[model samples]
Target chain A: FLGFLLGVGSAIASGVAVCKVLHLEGEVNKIKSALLSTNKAVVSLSNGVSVLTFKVLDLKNYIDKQLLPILNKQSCSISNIETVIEFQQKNNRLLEITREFSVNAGVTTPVSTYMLTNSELLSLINDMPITNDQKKLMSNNVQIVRQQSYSIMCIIKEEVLAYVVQLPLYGVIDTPCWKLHTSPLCTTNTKEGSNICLTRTDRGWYCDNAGSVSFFPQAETCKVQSNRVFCDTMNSLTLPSEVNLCNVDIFNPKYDCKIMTSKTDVSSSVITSLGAIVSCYGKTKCTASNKNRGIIKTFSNGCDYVSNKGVDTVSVGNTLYYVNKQEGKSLYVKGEPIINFYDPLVFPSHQWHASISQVNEKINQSLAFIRKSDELLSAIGGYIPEAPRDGQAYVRKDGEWVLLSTFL
Target chain B: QNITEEFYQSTCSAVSKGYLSALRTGWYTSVITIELSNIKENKCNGTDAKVKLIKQELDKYKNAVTELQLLMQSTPAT
Candidate 1:
């Protein structure tokens, strides 16, 4: 029941001598190569025997268990699938419309409203039905519904990345940005004095354990009091200000950057900025600066991929974060823990190979999913869905696949 | 852990260079989102150029570290 497939071996004896790998010197790679053949064996041998290379948790199980529930929960609301189903069943509008052409919902059984099985939906559009051009439109909608069913499921089973052109205007002060900023939780004033830093720790410094502005930027108490800062009109609090604003070779004197005679209007010489921007305003400006030199970025653009870099233990481990404004009020639920993972796929080049080297041998360039793609084995047992048609974004009109938009 | 490096150091000479090279290529494929998300709302302008520049480097380190974690998982679960 061990290694026996795609033709491999050299020696005499039953499964023990010929198949137990002739032994790996108990050596790992030789053993790994031995186990790898297990995945190779399964393509032929699932008729009997099990281990086909152990520990590869089918992920289909996890994807279904974790992500499918979330997908089911998310899709419970209204969608185009419901639209097509409506026209076919309850509305019966499809029945009348199709009668003009000639069609019926076929052998696929009762499609319940809350539960949308594409199989039933596909049956709803059974081609035998007839003639309204409008009725046929439901077919277009069903094509879409099935493809999307394939899609939302993919997002869970696959780690499709959600990107950010740049992080939001202003958001959380994740670990990276905080470190780039003066590197201290609290630094006693350089007021012609030495500085004692708050040192390293987390679950965080007690408001009582520390003390923040001219050094005012540094004055504050434990529970969160106040100190010196360039508090602008927005009353923003941040770590950086425009270099253009601060470096005044001009005799602007006490640097009355705040003495906005016009109060809220203008350019370089004088515009309104009481102190550093705070709240969302400061966050934007500081994040703008940090997005470059400091740390690639930070913040939430009201989406799941909280744009920032740090210990990405969440790929397997569920790591969550909070918000800047919502603070302790809400959780910034990042979904990687639920949908993303490549761990079970990792191993010493086994029956399931990888595009990676020494990871496993590929019968190079086969393009067969069974071969060496990194995603190959991970996809095993996964309900990998495919397109219903040849991606005809080109909708058929007048029996031709290319027609310009009418509403334009 | 050191699993990635162990895997790294153990491969034959012909494949050693190819291993991390594939890592870089994988990360490069990931950043294609720059082109994808570059539509109107997240539109491209002069400013996005800088952000894109920074995004590329961060993804490399991110992918590299991520692969290391895979090695860590591959070994320890046993």
Candidate 2:
């Protein structure tokens, strides 16, 4: 029994020793895994940093050697130089922190974890100054660097935090608005249905509607009909008055027609009985004629007259007797030939007037009487009156007729 | 000789190397951050030539990162 117990004890001790060795191996393996993970994270971080650093160095060299001189020559402000100096100082500080960490790492000593954080790095990159011409170039470069850094961070975070939090990949985020084809700016899609021909900016990539003078936003209801663009908002539809009715069919018969006249020097006369005579009986019908009739008639002499019994005429007429014909005798003397019955009455005549010679004789006798009176007055030593005589015979204050004399 | 000592030594070496690499990365990141910021502050507008250079650099960086990721993935777990 002692021999059996001794063997068993040895076996049990050997088992425990083997178990400890295995346990130690297992612990070592765990440590190795952690180290490997850390190593990979570090390598990824290093690659990311190296690329980003290369870009930075390239940018810095360009700025210092190429850009600065140009800017200086252009008389850029002192602030630009100050900005470069400030950035250099920040970069140096970050390098100092990293160097301190590396030195402490080599000696296996605890160092301050004072390295630049991801947010600080991002802030620095975000605040990068860019010229108008260089915006797209610098933006692309920065975005690439940012993405690389994000990848490094992802690995580092996974290794350090052991999956406690998840980080998103960069450049995969979607922008909030739609981009216009012509412009770089973002715009909403709300105006898609408007009448305005959606063209890009003044100089843009989309359709060139610049020459379209009447291009405007059409209403939603506007549409193309019968091979022509149509809009309901138009107040009226006008058809050409000279259009041949045989060739063109106007389906809507109740349409109103408005005749437009050109401006003229004279006023237009009103049409009372003006008629538009359409003689169309079939498709090849001749042109229509216009007929006008009224109380006013135009003669061959081109003079207009008002008609009596629908015919223009002239007549001679009086109350007692009248000649209604266009050609007739005078109506006043048709019925009477006058005769004088009294001794001293003047004879009435019909077409039997005194001749011009007899009138002349009478005038001569009156002149002789006037001459004799003038002589007698002058002989009597009375001054001939300069005033006109009333007549061959002048009536005195008593109303008796007397021969006119120049004497007072 | 215990394999644990050898494993421990190897792990310690890897960890230190990793730490150094991480520190170097940190330093470079700082450099890049500062350079970008300076570019922004100075408003060094990029020309087409500069833009082309930037694109090329970005492509090179992307390729480098891709290689690194591949290396990381292919690395054997302890």
Best by TM-score: 2
State which candidate has the highest DockQ: 2
**TM-score per candidate, chains pooled:** 0.13, 0.14
Task: Kindly report the docking quality category of candidate 2.
Answer: incorrect
Candidate 2 per-residue lDDT, tens place, A1-408, comes to 011111111212222222222223333233233344232111112112211121122224444563455455333323334444543454444444334423333111111222333444344444334233233322333323332221111111111111001111221111111101110111111333211111111110011111211111222212211211222211111223321121122112432211111111111111111111111111111221112342232212100111122322221111111111122111111111011111111111111223223333444666677779887877774334333464354434333444556666
The weakest ten consecutive residues by lDDT in model 2 chain A span: A177-186
Best by lDDT: 1
User: So what's the TM-score on candidate 2?
Assistant: 0.14
Candidates' C-alpha lDDT: 0.25, 0.23
DockQ of 2: 0.02
Which residue runs of candidate 1 sit more than 4 Å off their true CA positions?
A1-183, A202-408, B1-78
